[PDB]
């Protein structure tokens, strides 16, 4: 298993303009568009991001690219921030994995506000950052997901995915 394929599980893949769990515009493995209410801001948004008149529509090819751009952008961005980057080089292959999935599900700077959590994770404390993670709106809104990476930090392994 790796990020590619526990991104895919998590998000899911949808190639029509859809609404993500929050209300917004999304379309592709978990790519949202904006924030905006107006389809039509979010048609035009994924117009420039895929250089075409879709008119909301995408190919399989063109959802995995915009995939593969945002892989790579989360994990940039974790390399350049410097609350996430020291716990990031702390931590085993697996876990890389966990923050990388938190920071593409909720932006850096939302990760970058759990604080205590990576304190605990660069201490390597498994269960008790496990149970401060579970205190978050995060955890009270998307809490199978929430729980399947919390498992990811807790016992390092793919076990909580391998069901699915």
Same mark, same amino acid.
């Given at each position: 298993?790796?990020?590619?394929?526990?991104?895919?599980?998590?998000?899911? +893949?949808?190639?029509? %303009?859809?609404?993500?769990?929050? @209300?917004?515009? /999304?379309?592709?493995?978990?790519?949202? =568009?904006?924030?905006?209410?107006?389809?039509?801001?979010?048609?035009?948004? +994924?117009?420039?991001? %895929?250089?075409?008149?879709?008119? @909301?529509?995408? /190919?399989?090819?063109?959802?995995?690219? =915009?995939?593969?751009?945002?892989?790579?952008?989360?994990?940039?961005?974790? +390399?350049?921030?410097?609350?996430?980057?020291?716990?990031?080089?702390?931590?085993?292959?697996?876990?890389?994995?966990? =923050?990388?999935?938190?920071?593409?599900?909720?932006?850096?700077?939302?990760?970058?506000?759990?604080?205590?959590?990576?304190?605990?994770?660069?201490?390597?404390?498994?269960?008790?950052?496990?149970?401060?993670?579970?205190?978050?709106?995060?955890?009270?809104?998307?809490?199978?997901?929430?729980?399947?990476?919390?498992?990811?930090?807790?016992?390092?392994?793919?076990?909580?995915?391998?069901?699915?």
């Amino acid at each position: 298993m790796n990020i590619f394929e526990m991104l895919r599980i998590d998000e899911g +893949l949808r190639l029509k %303009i859809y609404k993500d769990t929050e @209300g917004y515009y /999304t379309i592709g493995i978990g790519h949202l =568009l904006t924030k905006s209410p107006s389809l039509n801001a979010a048609k035009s948004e +994924l117009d420039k991001a %895929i250089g075409r008149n879709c008119n @909301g529509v995408i /190919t399989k090819d063109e959802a995995e690219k =915009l995939f593969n751009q945002d892989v790579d952008a989360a994990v940039r961005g974790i +390399l350049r921030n410097a609350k996430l980057k020291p716990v990031y080089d702390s931590l085993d292959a697996v876990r890389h994995c966990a =923050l990388i999935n938190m920071v593409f599900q909720m932006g850096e700077t939302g990760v970058a506000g759990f604080t205590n959590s990576l304190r605990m994770l660069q201490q390597k404390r498994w269960d008790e950052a496990a149970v401060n993670l579970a205190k978050s709106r995060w955890y009270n809104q998307t809490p199978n997901r929430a729980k399947r990476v919390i498992t990811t930090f807790r016992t390092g392994t793919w076990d909580a995915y391998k069901n699915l």
